[model samples]
Structure formats: structure tokens, C-alpha cells
Target: SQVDVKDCANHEIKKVLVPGCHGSEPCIIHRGKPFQLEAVFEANQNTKTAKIEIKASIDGLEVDVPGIDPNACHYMKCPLVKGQQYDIKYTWNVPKIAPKSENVVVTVKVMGDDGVLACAIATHAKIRD
Candidate 1:
């Protein structure tokens, strides 16, 4: 279900998607367990040092506030060389606090000298005990 996701623009080379997820389907993450969000994308052109932001939403409520927590971002020093594919992996220990919804939406945005280089969003299910 493409309806479950959205993007900022249309790009062929600069696109993002979850590796193991299908349209409108969320990959599952068990609560309190260690998990990873693997995002794949390509660089159409060489990119300058940039900042990457990882944002999350539980039932449409924004959870990760930008600039409030540095741990939620890949500090403003990510660079993507062109003519190749890239994988950005983030490991996290799912919060012990239960969420408003099992459905989670995480968006990753890469910004640099050219403004936004790539933006990718993923939806997942959080299972709690």
C-alpha cells in the first residue's frame, strides 16, 4: 500500500527504500530487543558532507524531535560518493515504553550542500510483551 508512505520528491538515482519491506507492509521489531533499520539508496552525483536525520512517528505522532537529541541523528558529516549504491544502518534498542500504536513510521532525510539529497521512510510493526 503506497498509501501508507510518502516522499518529498521524484528521483531515480537518489531514492530510498527499506530492504525487506513491501508496499504498506511494516517489518516487525520485537519490543525491548535490539534491531536495525537498513536503508538503501544511490548517489546520482557526489555529495558534500551532510547531516542525516532519523525521525519516527507512532500513530502519526512525531516521536524523534530534531536537534533535541543528538543520538537520533547521524551527525552532520555524512558523505555519499556518486556512481554507486549505499547502505545506511542504524542499530537501536527499542524503547521499553509502549507506544500509542504498533505501527511505526521512520523517515530518514539526508541533507548537504545541495539541500536534501535523499529522503526515505519506512513503516514497521512494534511487538510488545
Candidate 2:
């Protein structure tokens, strides 16, 4: 069950969001851990496939990255050196593309790789260990 599935599905615009697996209950996110973050979008429908600027900020630090390639994957290395258990926020903006509207926002919840999965039974017959 992907977290962003419903969010993107509800949105009537295609290629309008970056698909990603958000931090759920029982996630192992920690400092110095190598985690992956990517933006997933498509190029279809009347919505423009122009480039979108995405930036991640944590502990008063901001990292700006290009959200081009339309349907390409933009990965990131999450280094939360502040503490072992801390929250993160990711926001996307396109000043050049959407000059007349507010910047888009994508709030990503993350955790260190400690205890990782809660080992709870999903909506399935078997549990994935």
C-alpha cells in the first residue's frame, strides 16, 4: 500500500505529483543512515510537463535540486546529523513555471532505519518480514 497512491490518484491532474513512499508507523530513520528520496511524475494530460524545482530543508538547512526530466527519478541522500530521531520537511517550488501561483508543497515524513517496520499485519493474508 503506497502512501502517495491515494493523494496522487485523487488529484485530477496527471504528471502533477512526485510519487513516493512516506514514513509510516514503525519506520527506522536515523542520523548518518543512507536513505533514498525521489520525485516521481509523468508527462500526460493537459498539464504541462515543465521542470519543477524541489528543495528539502532540515535543521535550518536547505538543499535545492532540479525537478526536470518530466518522468524521471530525482534521488537524495538523507543525512540527519542533528539527532537520531528527528522530523524532516520537503517542499517543491517552480518560480519560473508557475509564476502566477503559489509554490507546491510535498511534506515527507521520514525515520531512521531502527526497528524499521512495525511488523504489523497489512491488509493481506501474509506478513512481509
Candidate 3:
């Protein structure tokens, strides 16, 4: 005897979770504050270490954005492993005074081991009060 009949009500919903920035592309950055950037990784993407580059520009001209370390503009760190999902984050400090209503282009680059590109994300950031 085999039971393979669905004559009542049956529904299924699926949800997916990815490891990356999940918000407005051109997010707002407040002055005199720290901005939090987040990223996740797939299995074996980078189970060890990673390097990061945070860049900012306005009107195609490169602009300076205060980060954690001034001497080393680029940041290098390791990602945490949680069974399958690997999570990593870096923070940046906004300048005391930011241009009003100015379109700022921000790019976040992640490098895997041996200077290999893991993931690169670029977005427009608005300088806000």
C-alpha cells in the first residue's frame, strides 16, 4: 500500500540567505560616525584569511575617508566560521564634515589567500548629517 494522494491543502515556502551586503546600494553614511560593512562566504571560499580595501570617491575624483588605521589604508583580517556560514565585518569612520547631497562612490574589495580576489562590491554612499 502506497500513500501518494494530496487532495486537501498543501503549501511550501522557500527562503534563501546569502553572505553579502543586503541593503540599499547607495547607503547613507553619517558624519562623525562609524559605518559597518558586512559580508558572508560560501563553503571553501576563504576558510583562512582575507584582505580588504575600502575606497571612496566623489565626482570621479578620489576622496579620503578616515578608517581604523591611517598608516595602513587597507585592512586585513580573518573570517569566523560557523559550521557553513562564514561571517566577516569591517568598520569605517566618516569624516567630521561631509559634503552635502554629494554622490560618493564607495567600493569594498575582498581578497582571498595569495592576493586572489574573493569578492568585490561597489556602491554609491551618501554623506549625511
Candidate 4:
């Protein structure tokens, strides 16, 4: 019925926020509907290129969500400045193709030119019909 959020980045990500979800609480996501995922993090260095990658685990196997453009610039301002805090919001439509289950896990990663800038994981999300 909800998802537990976590930060998977190595100090690159300062905080992760699921708008309607409380601290360490699972957030609800409905199938065939759109949900927003937000993250607050500081940039360690300047970069002109970045991208966001989304993946989900179902039945213990991780698979990439198709038709998603990984370009970060598409959702936010680019050329991230060092030491600047960035609050980004990403909206995704949960595909009806997702199998109905209570054990689904979703992960979002912000990739910079050098490495991962930020990462968030939503564990145990219920994908309902």
C-alpha cells in the first residue's frame, strides 16, 4: 500500500522528499496514474550534462522502465553549480503493464558526467490494478 524511501547516494544526496509521505513512511502510488518523486541535493561539482535513470524491481528482478528519457535537463535547469542545493521534482505515470503486487520496489538515479549525483529508492510499493 506504500513505499519506504531511502537515499542510495554516497553523501551526494542531502535529502529525499516524497511530498505526501512522512518520515520513513511508505508512499502510495496507483497504477495507470501519475506520481511525483522529488529530491533535494547539493552539487559537488559543476556539470553541463546529467540524466535520470529509473528502474523497478518486481518479483525480485530489476527492469528498466521503458520509454523514459533519461535526460535530466528535460526536467530541470542544467549546468549545475558546485555547492548549490537543487530541489527537483519528477513526475512519472505508472504503466498499467506493471504487474499487480505488493512487493514492488522503484529506484531513481541522477547520473552526472562523472558519476551518480543522487539516488532514491522506494521499497515495497504496492502496484495495484
Candidate 5:
């Protein structure tokens, strides 16, 4: 199965890539294993404090992932420059509590002190044991 990615905010995303998955494919996350998510986007505004938000929907039920950090500065520099393209990468371990053989939809959002800076959603993703 392939994952479909889309930009929710007006960040003008260039591309979203998931390691171990093909182009434009939904990532196959293994339980208790770390997976990489990378995104290329252009910032539209400057932000002094930026935060990351991650959510997952399993079988149409949305749930918060508390294992991942919400601080955007942890992965990238703060005070994002306007019109500057950024390549942000992060690794997250798939929690054991995640249901196996289930379709999962993941949403990632970058929120700044002003407002949302970037947002991306990956649909049709799956969790495997």
C-alpha cells in the first residue's frame, strides 16, 4: 500500500520522504523500531519559538503520540527564516502499544509562536509487527 502525503498548512512543501518506503509510499512502521521522517519545506514567516505536533489515527480514531518530543528546536534551529527552505529530519520509535496490522494515518504539524508554519499528513500508513 502507498501512503498519500499532503500539506495542510500554507508552507509550500516541496516533498515528504519516509525511509524504507518507496516514493510517495506510506511508511511501514515496525513495532519497537525507529523510523525516519523527512520533509522539505519553505518557511513563510519567521518564528522565534516553534513546536512540533504529531498525531496518529488508527482505524479512524485519532490519538496523541506522547513519546515524541514537541519541541521543534530539538530537530532544527529556532527563529526560522522567512522564504528559507528547510530540510527537517527526525527519527521516532514506533511504540509497542501501536496496534499491528492496522491502517494508521499520521499528521505532523510545525507550530510557531505566530501560527502554524508547516503541516503534513500521511494517509494509508500501516503498523506491522
Candidate 6:
């Protein structure tokens, strides 16, 4: 025989987790101080493979940290830290980047994923703090 109907209430809720920058504002780290920059990533939910890379360079010195080098690259599991703003020149890119004069573009690429251009949310800052 078939089971009884309406024996219990039925309900369902959905949640979404995505790999992206969740910061509302850029974080600044003072020099000689310990700081952390945690990237947001949700495996199998936001992304099975996620990577965040950041590079900040002074006149001739450059400091780089692959925020999310996936489970590949060097894959830093440590919290990202930064030094106080300086006359820094940086190249930020993800997947496909457009070359430029003494500089290059960076793109945030998520495989098996598609959406509107995020760079459109452009950011401009002169690191001289």
C-alpha cells in the first residue's frame, strides 16, 4: 500500500556560496604591524578550485602573495599581510589580461563559470601612505 499523504510539513531553502571578493572596502595594513587578508572561497559551492593573487611593488622591490593559488601553485594557506602604502606599482590580473605600456591588465577568471565583467567595478588608489 502507498504511504499516507500530508503526514508532515514540507519545506526547502536554498543557499549560494561563491568565490569572490567580499570586502566592501580596500583593506590597508600599516607597516611594522601584523595584518591578515583572508580571501573568500567555498569549495564545490562557490568554486571547486579558487585562487587569489596579489602583487604590490615599491620603486624596485615587489612583494607578491597568491591570495588563492588554488590547491596548485605554492598554494599559500597562511593569512596574507601587507605593508603600509608606498609609491607602489602593481599589476593585478586573473585569467585573460590586456597588455599595456610598462604595465599589463589582470583578469579574475573562474573556470566553468560565466558572468558580467567585474573589472567594471574598477578601483583606483595611489599607494603613498
lDDT of 1 by residue, 56-121 (tens): 777666667443222212443345567546544555555655554466677766554465556666
Error at 124, model 6, angstroms: 11
**Candidate 3: deviation at residue 88, Å?**
2.2
My TM-score estimates for the predictions, one after another, are 0.57, 0.30, 0.48, 0.71, 0.70, 0.25
Q: How close is candidate 1 to the true structure, as a TM-score?
A: 0.57
Q: Rank candidates by lDDT, best first.
A: 4, 5, 1, 3, 2, 6
Please identify model 4 stretches exceeding 4 Å from their true place.
1-4, 19-21, 26-35, 60-62, 66-69, 74-77, 127-129
Error of 6 at 108 (Å): 9.8
For residues 1-129, what per-residue lDDT tens digits would candidate 6 score against the true structure? 111111111111112111222334432222221112222222222222223333334223333454433332123422222221111012334322111112211222222122210111111112333
Per-residue lDDT over 1-129 for candidate 3, one digit per residue giving the tens place of the 0 to 100 score = 211111111111111122222343334444453445554444244435545555656545565554543211133234423234433456765555644436654554444454433343444445455
Error of 4 at 37 (Å): 1.2
What are the per-residue Cα lDDT tens digits for candidate 5 across 6-38? 778874677777644555555565456454566
Q: Considering summed lDDT, which 10 consecutive residues are worst modelled in model 3?
A: 5-14
Give the Å error, residue 62, model 3: 2.4
Candidate that beats the other on lDDT, 1 or 3, i.e. the better one: 1
Number of backbone-clashing residue pairs for each candidate, in the order shown: 1, 7, 0, 2, 1, 6
Candidate 4 residue 110 Cα shift, in angstroms, is 0.3
Candidate that would win on lDDT: 4
User: How much is 36 displaced in model 6, in angstroms?
Assistant: 1.5
Q: Compared with the true structure, what per-residue lDDT tens digits does model 4 show for residues 12-76?
A: 78666653456556555444544467777788888776677767676565666643555666556
1 or 2, greater by lDDT? 1
Give every collision pair in model 3: none
Better of 3 and 6 by TM-score: 3
Minimum summed lDDT over a 10-residue window in model 1 is located at: 67-76
TM-score ranking, high to low: 4, 5, 1, 3, 2, 6
For candidate 4, the 10 contiguous residues with the lowest summed lDDT are: 26-35
